[PDB]
Amino acid sequence: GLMQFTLPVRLCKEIELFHFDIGPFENMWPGIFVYMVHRSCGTSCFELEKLCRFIMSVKKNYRRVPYHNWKHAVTVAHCMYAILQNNHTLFTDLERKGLLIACLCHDLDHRGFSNSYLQKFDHPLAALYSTSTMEQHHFSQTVSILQLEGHNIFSTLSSSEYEQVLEIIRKAIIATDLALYFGNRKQLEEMYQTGSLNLNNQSHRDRVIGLMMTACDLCSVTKLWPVTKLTANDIYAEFWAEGDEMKKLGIQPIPMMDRDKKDEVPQGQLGFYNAVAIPCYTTLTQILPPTEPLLKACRDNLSQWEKVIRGEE
Numbered sequence: 001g002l003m004q005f006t007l008p009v010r011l012c013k014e015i016e017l018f019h020f021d022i023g024p025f026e027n028m029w030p031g032i033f034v035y036m037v038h039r040s041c042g043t044s045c046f047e048l049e050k051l052c053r054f055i056m057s058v059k060k061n062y063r064r065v066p067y068h069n070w071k072h073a074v075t076v077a078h079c080m081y082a083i084l085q086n087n088h089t090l091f092t093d094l095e096r097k098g099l100l101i102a103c104l105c106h107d108l109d110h111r112g113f114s115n116s117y118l119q120k121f122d123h124p125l126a127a128l129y130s131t132s133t134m135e136q137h138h139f140s141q142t143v144s145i146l147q148l149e150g151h152n153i154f155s156t157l158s159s160s161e162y163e164q165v166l167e168i169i170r171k172a173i174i175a176t177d178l179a180l181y182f183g184n185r186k187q188l189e190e191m192y193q194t195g196s197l198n199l200n201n202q203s204h205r206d207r208v209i210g211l212m213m214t215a216c217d218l219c220s221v222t223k224l225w226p227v228t229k230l231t232a233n234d235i236y237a238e239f240w241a242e243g244d245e246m247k248k249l250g251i252q253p254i255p256m257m258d259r260d261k262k263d264e265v266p267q268g269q270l271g272f273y274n275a276v277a278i279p280c281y282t283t284l285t286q287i288l289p290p291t292e293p294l295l296k297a298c299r300d301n302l303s304q305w306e307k308v309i310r311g312e313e
């Protein structure tokens with residue numbers, strides 16, 4: 001109970017900022033996550049022994065892939081921590097509990113392949129889950145780990161609070177399917193503009209939490225340029241591996257996944273910032289003004305990709 005986690009001074013300060021990078025010391029990441037739960041949720045939210053056991057089982061069930069790995073899980077949870085800490089009074093006690101766990105678990109057992117590749121491979125997961133294939137799997141893996149003896153960090157919730165938190169986690173993880181983002185943001189854009197947006201409306205909160213999940217999931221584009229640029233290499237390492245596997249099935253991959261078309265990455269990133277990233281952080285900043293630093297950082301990174309094309313870097 002009286003056992004806090006404390007970070008060194010530079011991390012204690014910078015962890016509060018949206019653009020924080022969790023660093024290359026893997027052994028510090030569990031402590032970073034517990035620190036964020038304690039400050040975001042409370043030192044009482046979870047039994048430390050159970051939380052520590054939950055965290056190490058989640059880590060074990062992330063694979064050694066270039067991008068969709070344990071570092072991504074903790075990185076996405078930190079972005080959620082910064083959103084929750086800058087929007088103190090907007091979120092319920094259950095939501096703060098659920099959303100940090102949702103972010104940590106959102107890509108459990110990712111193989112580094114898209115929903116499309118699983119469908120074209122005819123992977124068993126594609127027969128079990130026709131849409132949001134990997135995301136239904138990630139939620140399945142979360143429930144499985146929660147049911148390991150000693151791992152139920154929600155044991156002290158009432159039956160109804162427990163069903164509510166698992167429903168928050170399920171919707172939050174499903175919303176990380178980028179196929180669902182486009183329509184979620186359009187509906188949120190209209191509701192904000194026509195003034196019908198209502199945070200007491202559960203289905204409205206669900207939409208807002210979904211956009212927060214997209215914002216945390218894409219948060220590579222909101223870091224300092226050197227972090228953004230080096231994460232891109234890991235992202236493209238997976239895309240190109242999937243491209244290779246598409247060619248093995250006798251299918252020409254989209255340019256994004258074709259390593260022969262490396263040259264066109266700068267312009268591909270522009271399309272992505274303009275079609276996905278900027279609209280995401282713009283709508284999020286409209287609904288939650290204190291998340292504006294995410295939009296400002298994204299615009300700075302867009303400008304950096306424009307500089308790459310122009311040959312200035």
Ligand SMILES: Cn1ncc(C(=O)N2CCC2)c1C(=O)Nc1ccn2cc(-c3ccccc3)nc2n1
Pocket residue numbers: 178217218220221232235255256257261262264265267268269271272
């Ligand atoms: C940075 N970041 N953050 C998240 C994601 C992303 O998508 N998710 C991670 C799992 C999914 C991305 C991304 O980089 N996404 C796109 C999206 C469209 N693109 C098109 C091209 C392209 C390249 C060369 C040649 C031609 C086109 N490049 C693209 N990149």
Ligand SMILES: [Mg+2]
Pocket residue numbers: 106107134176177
């Ligand atoms: Mg995912």
Ligand SMILES: [Zn+2]
Pocket residue numbers: 072076106107176217
């Ligand atoms: Zn993710």
